[PDB]
């Protein structure tokens, strides 16, 4: 159809985030590309205001699930692409176990031929010497299942999952995600059956990037419907 045809090949991506965590303000810009035929995302971000005040891994989920690979038998369950090119609003609250929380609102939509994710993030109530503001998180990422259900009343979807952030002392800090996606346009979207996205990420550094930065690779495939 229309929305899914926008994703048949490689699509450039722009990411812009303004954040405020415990009054510490910052901005991030990122760019790369997505290829939903492979379910693959590649991005590089820089903090344009200096040092990022939180660990980079805690922003991974905030920094475009329209690039998931949906198998052909599940095509009618791909809300994200069906809302394009007009886009969708992605809102989250992220609860870090025994620590603060992020509240994010993003617009994901096409601006020309580029898919753009513009985000506002506010974090509150973090312990200034917790795992987060104390940068005790390892610079890595694990695999998670992203659970999706329709929210017919709001003409969108509800999404939730729990991220495992490995800590430098060998423990794990859980980040509990609650997400709702709502279409920006008034065109019709696909309201899916219950399913999930199998996601995997890897983080690295660009040895020639002098600014505080993250390189992110994500693989995302939809499953859970025979």
């Amino acid at each position, epitope marked *: 159809s229309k929305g899914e045809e926008l994703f048949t090949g490689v699509v*450039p991506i*722009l990411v812009e985030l303004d954040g405020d965590v415990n009054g510490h303000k910052f901005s991030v*810009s*990122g*760019e790369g590309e997505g290829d939903a035929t492979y379910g693959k995302l590649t991005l*590089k971000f*820089i903090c*344009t205001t200096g040092k990022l005040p939180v660990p980079w891994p805690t922003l991974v989920t905030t920094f475009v699930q329209c690039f998931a690979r949906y198998p052909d038998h599940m095509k009618q369950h791909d809300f994200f692409k069906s809302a394009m090119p007009e886009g969708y609003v992605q809102e989250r609250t992220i609860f870090f176990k025994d620590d603060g929380n992020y509240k994010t609102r993003a617009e994901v939509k096409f601006e020309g031929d580029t898919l753009v994710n513009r985000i506002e993030l506010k974090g509150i109530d973090f312990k200034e010497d917790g795992n987060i503001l104390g940068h005790k998180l390892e610079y890595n990422y694990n695999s998670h299942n992203v659970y999706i259900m329709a929210d017919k009343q709001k003409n969108g979807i509800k999404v939730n999952f729990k991220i495992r952030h490995n800590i430098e002392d060998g423990s794990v800090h859980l980040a509990d995600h609650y997400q709702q996606n709502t279409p920006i346009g008034d065109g019709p979207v696909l309201l899916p059956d219950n399913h999930y996205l199998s996601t995997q990420s890897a983080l690295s550094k*660009d040895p*020639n*990037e*002098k*600014r505080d930065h993250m390189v992110l690779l994500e693989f995302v495939t939809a499953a859970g419907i025979t």
Partner: nanobody, 119 residues
Framework: QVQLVESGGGLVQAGGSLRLSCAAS?????MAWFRQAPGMEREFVGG????????YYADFVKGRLTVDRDNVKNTVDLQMNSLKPEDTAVYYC?????????????????WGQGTQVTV
């Protein structure tokens, strides 16, 4: 394709000042200056995002330099103060199609041919 035309530079001695300028054939995104000392690796000096809202200078360029940009003329300019003999190098204008001011040379799409600066 997009071509970058460098001018300025040349010979100075310590303490002096020098100016470099770069003119782009067309409009572009982030613009930056790099330099490459004789057998060293190309390092980022300073630049301006395509939107001009982000300016970044390397650590060694302290407050000694100023980059400005002109999206109508499609030019980025660099001015150098308090020159030291370690500033001797071949300076390169660089630009990207896209807007973000990354600093790795691999992120840049268009290059000038290199302008000698000798302090």
């Amino acid at each position: 394709q997009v071509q970058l035309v460098e001018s300025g530079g040349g010979l100075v001695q310590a303490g002096g000042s020098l100016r470099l300028s770069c003119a782009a054939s067309g409009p572009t995104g982030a613009m930056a200056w790099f330099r490459q000392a004789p057998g060293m690796e190309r390092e980022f000096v300073g630049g301006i995002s395509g939107s001009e809202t982000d300016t970044y200078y390397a650590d060694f360029v302290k407050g000694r330099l100023t980059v400005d940009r002109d999206n109508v003329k499609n030019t980025v300019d660099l001015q150098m103060n308090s020159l030291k003999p370690e500033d001797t190098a071949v300076y390169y204008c660089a630009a990207r199609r896209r807007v973000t001011l990354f600093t790795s040379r691999a992120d840049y799409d268009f290059w000038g041919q290199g302008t000698q600066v000798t302090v």
